[PDB]
Design a protein around this nucleic acid. Structure first.
Ligand code: 1N7
Ligand code: 1N7
Ligand code: MG
Ligand code: ZN
Ligand code: ZN
Lengths: 1337, 99, 49, 50, 79
DNA sequence: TCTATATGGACAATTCAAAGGCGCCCTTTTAGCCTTCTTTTGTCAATGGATTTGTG
DNA sequence: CACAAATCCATTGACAAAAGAAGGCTAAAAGGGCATATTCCTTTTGAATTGTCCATATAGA
């Protein structure tokens, strides 16, 4: 039909083009015979007829006269839905400034005229005149004149002079302004001046005038001369039942505009005084203004009730505009909801769905079926047949139901698995029975949670609900490959109670002939369900390449594991059900069954595991009671002891020995210790306290405490909640967060008295008030996310790049916190991995590192892998299938088509709610150094002279297991290659200290050092050793304010010692508080300390802030460029940093504050990307300095740090795709051949294709500076204006695209969902590619 | 509650509220993303065009559904076209480049 | 409400998440059978016809 | 008459429902004893003392 | 039939082109122009399309070929 | 060398957009209404041939 | 296998209802004209821009 939406300014001639006739009067209807009263806002003449094919005067009332405008009252007899499309205009008596181009924050009429907003409004309010066409008269053009000044001028200049005011003055300016002339002017002046604010304003204005000339617009189309009216059935005056009318608000706003308009025409007919027509033109400007957008300019003209009217811009804007409310999320036919409930007989491809809802939803189908089988002659007869609910409609429903998916849904639809299509089962009742393995996906309790059943009408949508959306097709979470059909709470109790083992039950140690007579020994009443036994299980292995090898052997097992083996399907080993089978073990069982036997056995085994888990959990009667909560017999003793101890601390605070805060932390640590003793006692009495006896005296195994089994299976509750029931509960903190110093010593089996309960209530309500409001935020994080990665869609099978990233195990200070297998599982290698000895050629480049390749990587101890990633992708407008990886769910590689921006945003966002002095080696290893400019101190150790020497512990395997950070000038007892073993401090330094240890030895000389100007003389009493403290700049006097104390070492001859490697003198200037150890005359030895110097947000604002990329408050100023450091002025502040490379130019200069610490030394050398101070990094800076891989590894490691601290799993692919959608823009450094401004910010894809095409020719490509935008700015500065208007503020986006004449060629998912057509993502991708080839064939 | 075809809103020809007006469910943004995350671009299209808003296509869908023919005709949802007349009734001009 | 003989045991998943498994004697003794009273209205208005 | 779930107590931690199940059982036990004294209808001396 | 569409995807790759192939073929069977190949087990036209597709006896190439054959016969209805 | 003079640069107020899921009196002019009229549009009832069996 | 009769399709014609109009009417809707004197209304967070000082570089004295 069409293929792009253009937006531009509407002209007077265009506005008269849409319209069918001026609306002259404000009458709506005739109040007695409610006719559209011509010719007011609902004019039958102008906007159409009121009933189909009937004139208004009643003369013509039949389709015989389609199209004939009547003679008597002139109403074109046509369908009355023309009433809903025909627009009308209003001929404004005076011009009137369109508010959007006058009050949008950067004012378009403002910066077009290069005129401040205040003066433009002083002209528009009819305050002050404005000059136009100054001629030869000694005035400017924009020269603002008040009454006084004009009154002076006009007495002298009746000619060659002119000064309008109000909207006509602005129209005259925009009509006389020439765009090409002033554009050349601005370019020559950009050629002239170089001031950042000046040049920025210049380039902004030049960009606007370029847009406004390149476009077809005009300036004077801003000041409205002819206003349009919306139709009459989009602003209706429908009469609600009761004789009361129910008008819209636009009827009010138009009625007011037209009244003030007609009145102004009169006030110009009577030749009125000036002040009255000025007042009327102001009132009309206000009225047109409050119509186009109300509440923008000044206060909102209030509606009749008492309220601001909802003017047009409030139609479109906000959470309830057309864009988000009626256009992205529609209400839907064929849909219903009722309470959900359990129904465990179900197979997990079906949902029990009630007869009555199903007969209501499926009435078109039933009517067609009945009149097809002939049981009902006409459609009306079929209607009354199904309304009477005869015995044939239920047969017909059971038949038009049969193979037909429905789409259950739950209200907060966080991730893409909360819409799964089931196959209905017709079930009595009024509750939608939902399968019990599905609650983990939907996140459903069965205490009232309602669900919506939509319907796939057509044939293609039944196919997509069956293939794509079915419930047996997404049993793996798209955020990480692990299963989401994990048996949940009763079923794991049933398995954990089957597959356990008492010590002396019936049938202890009797040999069974297979699983079959284990089941018979159980059901017959001869063996206990867990009484250890020898059986003959015959497992299979998939050893042969696709074949099943049989084998049998007397495994030692129990009756329970033997009864459970009758379900493990044919591929798995027996040692997978020969353990205890908690919850981790059972999700593991399903995962390995998925990875060995594919999908169908995993689904049928999921159901068999549900059924047997439910059955034996029922058979166990695992009931809970007040005697299953065993209090330790040592709890009152523990509390008495800790209480007496805290009384001792009360005394030692009353005797002045201890400070207040120290006394506090004393008491608080003592209660933490007693609490942990009570907890550990209850657990030692709770877990094993079953003592038994087999043919002998006494043994003890794990217990059968009902509450303990429920806590040990993984069914419900952790050891924390068990702790609160048995042991004393917690140390409840006051709403300050200042933890109380007397814990609620009593648990829920005893009674919390009134005090203890009232103290529990604080935290109870804080938790509830959070979890109410974490859904406010994290519903907005996902919204911004899935609105930034809207369009990012897998659009090529491969783009053939060699780029990548280096996937390695995170090592968070010593203990590794994520292996390499989880990180490089499913991603495609970019370079062929080599064997550790290099030994070989190994895994090819473009392979996919699925499970078995993680086996080859883990067996051979691979050190690290480089693997292709989305943020190093060369595809245009997409992300190819190899540079992405695989999925999670459907284990194979990503399909050419699938929409990964969305499942990426959803995965990163739906777990939002779940969120809030010396190195000591830990295990075996051989120490390995990293970036170590060490030197031997005067003691013989190893001191490192590089702040960025990370301390590794390379095991003998060939990998890293420890990674600590060694500060500058540490002192290492060990070195590189010196083997060490656990519990061994190999590093030593002091954090409060900062030494200035040099690289040469000799006499210490005070060079350019004077007491009072360079140093202080202040002897310490209790020590006596003098330190002439090196103070900073502005503290010392003025004659030496530029005189800096430098330390430089020499030999006995006086000549300056030559540094190892350099012939430069090592004179070292000291900073403020650089208190020196040894003075002049005292020679310092090797590696000798010269002088000392003195010296978190998290949860999901930390993730919100790593994604919006907000700059921190004290960034860590990176090293702009590589070379040497120097100070030249030291400041009128401040401090001045100078980086002087070895060969390149060096006009660099950075106004560092002297208030901050400076990590580097004045006489040291730093690489770019090195820190020249401390504190957090900034992501913009990381991007500017170290490429994209630096910033992307930063964003990933930070936000995965959050999600991992909270124990959630998210595959890094998704954070990398959001990071790609963050850095999609790039500023043209200097336009190489053609054709951009070198301050312009063009899409990286477009300048990339441009310089690729130009370098394809002979010319010179464009140099581009990659940017990094936050997610809100990233999504709001897009090529397509509909997908920016929908998201967030619609006023700015519409007005900017309007002036810039921007054109939307859809090519997105948000646009093709707005405009009602196939999303170009999954099944629609074929349609859109075929369409792109069907154009331009 | 359940709604095969009922009474439709006035300005934007979509269904009504909940169970008192006999009104379809809300298929809001989050469910649209959950269909875009699959490939259901056919399901989603009939979900926001025929079942909901396309005021000609929805009667012509009911006719097909009774004729034993599960086709559809996509067209332009009426609420988008309300959007065009409301923007275009500002000073803006937003039209459909035809080709 | 009314008090009735409960029992804390998993019963084959008909009380899975928080669901409840009411026996037929509670529906049969009419002990949770409530009485709801609605008010329909047929207003008879005056139209120009 | 109703079969609630064991696995709801340790995680929600409303131990009240269990103590109140137990004491309700005690109470309905005294109810059964008094009903048994009023079916045999022996004397009001035994009822009064019980 | 039918619980899953795994094997039908292993035969017709890409898992969305499966949907389009099955929907085209089910329209053929439903709009009264053709006739199932594999014996219908009392399936609606959708599951029959997917059952056809599983056996390797229908996909996009076969559908194009049959369409061109049957449209050439209508040219051969020129008499 | 010292100061100023301003200028470009770093700093502080101001405004805007976001913040989740199911008075009166009279006078005149106008338009809705009703009633009869006339011409139109169907309905009630005749009057003839061309079409359909019967007989021998 | 022809000749005699009952059963069909067409115009005459008049006759009654029905509608399009027209006038005569009346309810209603819209102007116009008022003269003791009347003098001024009733929640934060972040980003970006704009108006405000600071570093500073240069130019004259
Ligand atoms: C749901 C709401 C109760 C919420 C508390 C109640 C209170 C007022 C009710 C409406 C009014 O009668 C006006 C209107 C009359 C129409 O004729 C029929 C529809 C309308 C919209 C009614 C439907 C509904 O019942 C309303 C919204
Ligand atoms: C403001 C109030 C909010 C509810 C509190 C709204 C909601 C719907 C409104 C009523 C409906 O129109 C129905 C009804 C029509 C009558 O004929 C005229 C008055 C009635 C009573 C309305 C008055 C009021 O405005 C209501 C109650
Ligand atoms: Mg719930
Ligand atoms: Zn008319
Ligand atoms: Zn790629």
């Amino acid at each position: 039909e069409f293929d792009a939406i253009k937006i531009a300014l509407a002209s007077p001639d265009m506005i008269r083009s849409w319209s069918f006739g001026e609306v002259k009067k404000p009458e709506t209807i005739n109040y007695r015979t409610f006719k559209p009263e011509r010719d007011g806002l609902f004019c039958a003449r102008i906007f159409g007829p009121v009933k189909d094919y009937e004139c208004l005067c009643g003369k013509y009332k039949r389709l015989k006269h389609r199209g004939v405008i009547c003679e008597k009252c002139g109403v074109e007899v046509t369908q009355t839905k023309v009433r809903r499309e025909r627009m009308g205009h209003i001929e404004l008596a005076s011009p009137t400034a369109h508010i959007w181009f006058l009050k949008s924050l950067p004012s378009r009429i403002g910066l077009l005229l290069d005129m401040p907003l205040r003066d433009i409004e002083r002209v528009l309010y009819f305050e002050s005149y404005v000059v136009i066409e100054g001629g030869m008269t000694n005035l400017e053009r924009q020269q603002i004149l008040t009454e006084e000044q004009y009154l002076d001028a006009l007495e002298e200049f009746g000619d060659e002079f002119d000064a309008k005011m109000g909207a006509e003055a602005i129209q005259a300016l925009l009509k006389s302004m020439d765009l090409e002339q002033e554009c050349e002017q601005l370019r020559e002046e950009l050629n002239e001046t170089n001031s950042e604010t000046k040049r920025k304003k210049l380039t902004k204005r030049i960009k606007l005038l370029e847009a406004f000339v390149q476009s077809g617009n005009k300036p004077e189309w801003m000041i409205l001369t002819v206003l349009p009216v919306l139709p009459p059935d989009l602003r209706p005056l429908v009469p609600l039942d009761g004789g009361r009318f129910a008008t819209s608000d636009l009827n009010d706003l138009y009625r007011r505009v037209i009244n003030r308009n007609n009145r102004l025409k009169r006030l110009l007919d009577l030749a009125a005084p000036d002040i009255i027509v000025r007042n009327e033109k102001r009132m009309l400007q206000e009225a047109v203004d409050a119509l186009l957008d109300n509440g923008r300019r000044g206060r909102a003209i209030t509606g009749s009730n008492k309220r601001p009217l909802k003017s047009l811009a409030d139609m479109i804007k906000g959470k309830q505009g057309r864009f988000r409310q009626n256009l992205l999320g529609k209400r839907v036919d064929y849909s219903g909801r009722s309470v959900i409930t359990v129904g465990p007989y179900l197979r997990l491809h079906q949902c029990g769905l009630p007869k009555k809802m199903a007969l209501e939803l499926f009435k078109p189908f039933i009517y067609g079926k009945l009149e097809l089988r002939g049981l009902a002659t006409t459609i009306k007869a079929a209607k009354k047949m199904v309304e009477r609910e005869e015995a044939v409609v239920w047969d017909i429903l059971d038949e038009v139901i049969r193979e037909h998916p429905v789409l259950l849904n739950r209200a907060p639809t966080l991730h893409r698995l909360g819409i799964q299509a089931f196959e209905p089962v017709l079930i009595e009742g009024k509750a939608i029975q939902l399968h019990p393995l599905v609650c983990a996906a939907y996140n459903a309790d069965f205490d009232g949670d309602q669900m919506a059943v939509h319907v796939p009408l057509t044939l293609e949508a039944q196919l997509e609900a069956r293939a794509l959306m079915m419930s047996t097709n997404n049993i793996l979470s798209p955020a990480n490959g692990e299963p989401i059909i994990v048996p949940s709470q009763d079923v794991v109790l049933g398995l954990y109670y089957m597959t356990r083992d008492c010590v002396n039950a019936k049938g202890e140690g009797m040999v069974l002939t297979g699983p079959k007579e284990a089941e018979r020994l159980y059901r017959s009443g001869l063996a206990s369900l867990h009484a250890r036994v020898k059986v003959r299980i015959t497992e299979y292995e998939k050893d042969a390449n696709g074949e099943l090898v049989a084998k049998t052997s007397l495994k030692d097992t129990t009756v329970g594991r033997a009864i459970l083996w009758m379900i493990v399907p044919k591929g798995l080993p027996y040692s997978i059900v020969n353990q205890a089978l908690g919850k981790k073990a059972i999700s593991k069982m399903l995962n390995t069954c998925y990875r060995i036997l594919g999908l169908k056995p995993t689904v049928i085994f999921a159901d068999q595991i549900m059924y047997t888990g439910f059955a034996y959990a029922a058979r166990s009667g695992a009931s809970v009671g007040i005697d299953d909560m065993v209090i330790p017999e040592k709890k009152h003793e523990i509390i008495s002891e800790a209480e007496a101890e805290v009384a001792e601390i009360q005394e030692q605070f009353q005797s002045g020995l201890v400070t207040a805060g120290e006394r506090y932390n004393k008491v608080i640590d003592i209660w933490a210790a007693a609490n942990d003793r009570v907890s550990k006692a209850m657990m030692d009495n709770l877990q094993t306290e079953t003592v038994i006896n087999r043919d002998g005296q006494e043994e003890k195994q794990v217990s059968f405490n009902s509450i303990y089994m429920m806590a040990d299976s993984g069914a419900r509750g952790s050891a924390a909640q068990i702790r609160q029931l048995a042991g004393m509960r917690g140390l409840m903190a006051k709403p300050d967060g200042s933890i109380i110093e007397t814990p609620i010593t009593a648990n829920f089996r005893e009674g919390l008295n009134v005090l203890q309960y009232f103290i529990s209530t604080h935290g109870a309500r804080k938790g509830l008030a959070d979890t109410a409001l974490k859904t406010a935020n994290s519903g907005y994080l996902t919204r911004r996310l899935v609105d930034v990665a809207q369009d990012l869609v897998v659009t090529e099978d491969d783009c053939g790049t060699h780029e990548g990233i280096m996937m390695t195990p995170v090592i968070e200070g010593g203990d590794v916190k994520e292996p390499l297998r989880d990180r490089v599982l499913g991603r495609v290698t970019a370079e062929d991995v080599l064997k550790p000895g290099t030994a070989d050629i190994l895994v090819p480049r473009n392979t996919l590192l699925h499970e078995q390749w993680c086996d080859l990587l883990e067996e051979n101890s691979v050190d690290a892998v480089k693997v292709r990633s989305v943020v190093s992708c060369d595809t245009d407008f997409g992300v190819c299938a190899h540079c992405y990886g695989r999925d999670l769910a459907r284990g194979h590689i990503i399909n050419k088509g699938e929409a990964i921006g969305v499942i990426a945003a959803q995965s990163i966002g739906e777990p939002g709610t779940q969120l809030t002095s010396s190195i000591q080696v830990k295990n075996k290893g051989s120490i390995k150094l990293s970036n170590v400019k060490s030197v031997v101190n005067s003691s013989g150790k190893l001191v490192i002279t590089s702040r960025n020497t990370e301390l590794k512990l390379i095991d003998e395997f060939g990998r890293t297991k420890e990674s600590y950070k060694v500060p500058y000038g540490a002192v290492l007892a060990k070195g590189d290659g010196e083997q060490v073993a656990g519990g061994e401090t190999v590093a030593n330094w002091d954090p409060h200290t900062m030494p200035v240890i040099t690289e040469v030895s000799g006499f210490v000389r005070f060079t350019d050092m004077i007491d009072g100007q360079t140093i202080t003389r202040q002897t310490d009493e209790l020590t006596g050793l003098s330190s002439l403290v090196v103070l900073d700049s502005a503290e010392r006097t003025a004659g030496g304010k530029d005189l800096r104390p430098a330390l430089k070492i020499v030999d006995a001859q006086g000549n300056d010692v030559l540094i190892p490697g350099t012939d430069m003198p090592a004179q070292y200037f000291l900073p403020g508080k650089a208190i020196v150890q040894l003075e002049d005359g005292v020679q310092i030895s090797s590696g000798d300390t010269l002088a000392r110097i003195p010296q978190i947000t998290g949860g999901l604002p930390r993730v919100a802030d790593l994604f919006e990329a907000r700059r921190p408050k004290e960034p860590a100023i990176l090293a702009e460029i590589s070379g040497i450091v120097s100070f030249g002025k030291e400041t009128k502040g401040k401090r001045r940093l100078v980086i002087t490379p070895v060969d390149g130019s060096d006009p660099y200069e950075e106004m560092i504050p002297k208030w901050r610490q400076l990590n580097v030394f004045e006489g040291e050398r730093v690489e770019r990307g090195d820190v020249i101070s401390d504190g957090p990094e900034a992501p913009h800076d990381i991007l500017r300095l170290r490429g994209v891989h630096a910033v992307t590894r930063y964003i990933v490691n930070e936000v995965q740090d959050v999600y991992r601290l909270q124990g959630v799993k998210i595959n890094d692919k998704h954070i990398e795709v959001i990071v790609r959608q963050m850095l999609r823009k790039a500023t043209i450094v200097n336009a190489g051949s053609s054709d951009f401004l070198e301050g312009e910010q063009v899409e990286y894809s477009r300048v990339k294709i441009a310089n690729r095409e130009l370098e394809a020719n002979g010319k010179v490509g464009a140099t581009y500076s990659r940017d990094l935008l936050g997610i809100t700015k990233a999504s709001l500065a897009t090529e397509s204006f509909i997908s920016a208007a929908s998201f967030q503020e619609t006023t700015r986006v519409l007005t900017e695209a309007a002036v810039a004449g921007k054109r939307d060629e859809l090519r997105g998912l948000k646009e093709n969902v707005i405009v009602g057509r196939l999303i170009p993502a999954g099944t629609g991708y074929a349609y859109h590619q075929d369409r792109m080839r069907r154009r331009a064939a | 509650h359940a709604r095969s075809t009922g009474s439709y809103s006035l300005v934007t020809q979509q269904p009504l509220g909940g169970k008192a007006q006999f009104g379809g469910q809300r298929f809001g943004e989050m469910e649209v993303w959950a269909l875009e995350a699959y490939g259901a671009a056919y399901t989603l299209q009939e979900m926001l065009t025929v079942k909901s808003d396309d005021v000609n296509g929805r009667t012509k869908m009911y006719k097909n559904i009774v004729d034993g023919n599960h086709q559809m005709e996509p067209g332009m949802p009426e609420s988008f076209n309300v959007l065009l007349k409301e923007i275009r009734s500002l000073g803006i001009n937003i039209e459909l480049e035809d080709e | 409400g009314q008090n009735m003989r409960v029992a804390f045991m998993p019963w084959n998943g008909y009380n899975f998440e928080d669901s409840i498994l009411v026996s037929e004697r509670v529906v049969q003794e009419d002990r949770f059978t409530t009485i709801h009273i609605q008010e329909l209205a047929c207003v008879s208005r005056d139209t120009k016809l | 008459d109703i079969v609630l779930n064991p696995l709801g107590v340790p995680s929600r931690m409303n131990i009240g429902q269990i103590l109140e199940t137990h004491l309700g059982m005690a109470a309905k036990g005294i109810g059964d004893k008094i009903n048994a004294m009023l079916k045999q209808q022996q004397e009001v001396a035994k009822l009064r003392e019980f | 039939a039918r619980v899953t569409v795994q094997d039908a995807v292993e035969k017709i790759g890409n898992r969305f082109d499966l949907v389009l192939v099955a929907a085209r073929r089910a329209r053929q069977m439903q709009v009264g122009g053709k006739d199932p190949l594999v014996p219908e087990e009392n399936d609606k036209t959708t599951v029959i399309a997917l059952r056809e597709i599983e056996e390797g006896l229908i996909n996009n190439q076969i559908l194009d070929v049959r369409e061109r054959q049957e449209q050439q016969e209508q040219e051969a209805a020129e008499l």
